[PDB]
Write a protein that binds this ligand. Structure first.
Ligand SMILES: CNC(=O)[C@@H](CC1CCN(C(=O)Cc2ccc3[nH]c(=O)cc(C)c3c2)CC1)NC(=O)c1ccc(-c2ccccc2)cn1
Length: 109
């Protein structure tokens, strides 16, 4: 694992996982269970922290930018599907500020 990919795994993913708002994002969205109509019609690329975790574990990414794109897809999926000011959006926004902070502190390429 690349120097930056290892940071994304051992710092960024770890710190997002430990954040008190991350639990809804630690597994695929169960739209049936959560009663989210049309979720998988509206979201053309689902993403969650466990999928990113396993992609890092399985050496799926060739570049750190590809992993960063998946994190961003998580957050943008949430903002696209849910109303602004919904709890899940407010939690995602706080999680996302932590994520961008950790990118600011990433070792350069
Ligand atoms: C006593 N239980 C509380 O009250 C909780 C209720 C929350 C309801 C929504 N959830 C779900 O898992 C259900 C759900 C709904 C739509 C979703 N749509 C998707 O796309 C993807 C997902 C996976 C999704 C999942 C998180 C729990 N809410 C909070 O804990 C809480 C924490 C912090 C804030 C906050 C307020 C202002 C500023 C910043 C943060 C608000 N609420």
């Amino acid at each position: 694992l690349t120097n930056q990919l290892q940071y994304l795994q051992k710092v960024v993913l770890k710190d997002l996982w430990k954040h008190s708002f991350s639990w809804p994002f630690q597994r695929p969205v169960d739209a049936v269970k959560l009663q989210l109509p049309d979720y998988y019609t509206i979201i053309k690329n689902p993403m969650d922290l466990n999928t990113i975790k396993k992609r890092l574990e399985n050496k799926y990414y060739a570049k750190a930018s590809e992993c960063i794109e998946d994190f961003n897809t998580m957050f943008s999926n949430c903002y696209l599907y849910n109303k602004p000011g919904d709890d899940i959006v407010l939690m995602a926004q706080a999680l996302e500020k932590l994520f961008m902070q950790k990118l600011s502190q990433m070792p350069q390429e």
